Amino acid sequence: MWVYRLKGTLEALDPILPGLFDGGARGLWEREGEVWAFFPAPVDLPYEGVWEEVGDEDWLEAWRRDLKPALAPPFVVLAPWHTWEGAEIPLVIEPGHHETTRLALKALARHLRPGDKVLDLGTGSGVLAIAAEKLGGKALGVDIDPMVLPQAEANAKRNGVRPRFLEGSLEAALPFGPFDLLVANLYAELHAALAPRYREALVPGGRALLTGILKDRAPLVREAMAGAGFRPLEEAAEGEWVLLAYGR
């Protein structure tokens, strides 16, 4: 579809709106002092607006404009352009809406202590490693996908903290270990396979917070972790997603 952009408020352009509709406009939006009228294709209009085809990028920007702060106690996840007046700890992330990210942040605050060394396995946006530093931890975030690291570093800088970010997996992290706590938002089957190595990555008495786990697959993880010698410490879920916390 195409957009016909006109300068002015809906209130100001009220007189020509019927014209846009008769002209075939299917949508109208007031966007920062402009009125955007949406059509299947450009048509001849005397209002002196400007035509432009709508693309995926336009959709992205619109969606982004509609985003609002997302609570995830004790934190609040904010877009870089968001302002926040509350008491919760700000986590500014470039567009935290996932159930698993919420479960992990909440569990992190409980199991993490100031001065703990943290491994955030599959760091992605880097949100968990960042929150770890905000809580007073010293974190290393790793991901097998290099593409995400630049954005992770950018997010970190925006939050005024600096965790270490690195390409790779668990093996790539060991040199910087052992760690006091490992947080991993992956999936049931992967956690199960890594159970033995999670134990090796943590100091005695260390913690493992696992999420990205679907309820009907929870048993797989309880079984692999017990088998690896971990004791269960906490369970929480949101929707069909669960987080399992263990002690080593």
Q: Which residues of 49-85 are buried (b: 16+ CB within 10 A; e: fewer)?
A: beeeeeeeeeeeeeeeeeeebbebebbbbbbeeeeee
Provide CB contacts within 8 A for 181, sequence distance 6+: 108, 111, 112, 116, 117, 118, 119, 132, 137, 202, 206, 207, 208, 209
Is 96-248 a domain of CATH 3.30.420.40? Answer: no
Exp. method: X-ray
List the CATH code of the domain at 56-95.
Answer: 1.20.5.1350
Residue ranges of the annotated binding site are 101, 122, 143, 169, 185
Let me know: does 1 contact 38? Beta carbons within 8 Å: yes
Which residues define the annotated binding site for S-adenosyl-L-methionine?
101, 122, 143, 169, 185
Q: Provide the greatest CA pair distance for the chain.
A: 75
Tell me whether the omega of the peptide bond preceding residue 42 falls within 30 degrees of 0, making it cis. Answer: no
Bridge-based pairing state of the strands 70-72 and 75-78: antiparallel
Nearby residues of 194 by Cβ (< 8 Å), 6 or more positions away: 170, 184
Resolution of the experimentally solved model in angstroms: 1.9
d(CA 152, CA 116): 20
Q: Where in the chain is the domain with CATH 3.30.70.1170?
A: 1-55
Residue pair 5/48 in contact by the 8 Å Cβ criterion: no
Query: For residues 70 and 76, what is the distance between their CA atoms, to the nearest angstrom?
Result: 6
Distance, CA of 206 to CA of 32 (rounded, Å): 51
Domain with CATH 1.20.5.1350 in the chain: 56-95
Range list for CATH 3.40.50.150 in the chain? 96-248
Round to whole Å and give the CA distance between 208 and 179: 10
The class level of CATH for 1-55 reads alpha beta
